[model samples]
Target: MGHHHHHHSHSTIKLTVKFGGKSIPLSVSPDCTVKDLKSQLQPITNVLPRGQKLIFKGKVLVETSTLKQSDVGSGAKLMLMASQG
Candidate 1:
């Protein structure tokens, strides 16, 4: 707990969610949910949020957690892998 601090202080957080092959830049509320983030990711990525995987920074993010509580509240790079099933 000492090494990790919840860094969630921003008016609007910008996220580069994806990879060099396919990705999109999206800005969202810091208090947004991880699942909420996925919603936005889908329309841009042409993939369903239900079939999407969100990996933040280097860690996996849970759908229940808020964007603020997640580990990235700034201009963090999120990785999204889509499984169309």
Candidate 2:
């Protein structure tokens, strides 16, 4: 009998991004770059990707670095702010 087949799950880790007097929940893939998340934040935040500053654990998350590379993980708290134009 064929018991069960393994299915790949594309699960995402959770992030808490605080901005504008409130915190917003975000789901991001483990390896997603900070820039990718910033792009997604545009609509809700009304800030451009380059204008967004994502800080995790007191360190600014860089655009070219992946979440894992930045030591980000599920339930990580981050600060979000728009750069002064």
lDDT of every predicted structure (CA atoms): 0.74, 0.78
Candidate 2: segments with Cα more than 4 A from true spot = 1-10, 83-85
Q: Please report, as a residue range, the 10-residue window in candidate 2 with the lowest summed lDDT.
A: 2-11
Whole-model lDDT, model 1: 0.74
Residue ranges of candidate 1 with Cα displaced over 4 Å: 1-10, 83-85
Evaluate residue 54 in candidate 2 and report its C-alpha lDDT on the 0 to 100 scale: 84
Instruction: Return the TM-score for each candidate structure.
Output: 0.70, 0.77
For residues 1-85, could you state the per-residue lDDT of candidate 2 as single tens digits?
A: 8745442354688888777577888888865789888877787667788768888778997888888888888898888776433
Task: Go through the candidates in order and give the clash count of each.
Answer: 0, 0
Q: Could you report the Cα RMSD, in angstroms, for every candidate shown?
A: 7.1, 4.5
**Residue 60 displacement (Å), model 2:** 0.7
How many angstroms is residue 24 displaced in model 1 relative to the true structure, after the best TM-score fit? 1.3
